[PDB]
Amino acid sequence: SESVPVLELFSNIWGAGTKTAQMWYQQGFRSLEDIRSQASLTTQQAIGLKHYSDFLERMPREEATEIEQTVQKAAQAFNSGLLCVACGSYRRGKATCGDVDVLITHPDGRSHRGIFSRLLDSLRQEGFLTDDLVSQEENGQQQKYLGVCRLPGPGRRHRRLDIIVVPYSEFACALLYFTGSAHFNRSMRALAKTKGMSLSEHALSTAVVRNTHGCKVGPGRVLPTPTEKDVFRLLGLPYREPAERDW
DNA sequence: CAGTAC
């Protein structure tokens, strides 16, 4: 049909943005069926197209809880020490969630290692994980997984699930980044910059060196941040609770 | 670049 809603239709495929949607449009594709039959699909895009309807639905908060518990039980089997916290919109207290954001670390600071591969393998044997989207094994000590899960039982939709494993020393910043919101994180890091500091999912750093155009030319030194409250303090900010961060 | 995560 008309160009704008067709671009919108294509854009709602995971792995496809405006550039891809516009390219498809030039090709003369107008429907999801057209994409399915004729378009050159990325593995991820093919998965997004297959779960198009489900991925458009936001799940009830209660379902996100079950998903996080499903992940938690599997991890704990490996080690009872593991701490799993659902982040994102769920931690911010939303009634519905676009996806489930599960963070995992271990208090001793060592046992978090070796878990990521096993946990995923465990979740696959269970039939929980249905498709894998992207894997990041190079984020320093943080491992990230993006995939598709589905709770057992009838009438269950496929849900987007992200699993991140971090060291206990980076727990606070990883928790901070991953609960958001996106605009909230954007503002905190913007502020940190003004103060000659930097904030990432890994750590908060002071004495960061920047140039005339404000381009970072040297890292500072990592400041020990055991809790979220410590990060707020070192930036001269009043602590906000997750619900207070839903910007 | 493009798309993605918050």
Place this chain on the structure above:
DNA sequence: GTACTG
């Protein structure tokens, strides 16, 4: 704003 893989 920061930062990952497709």
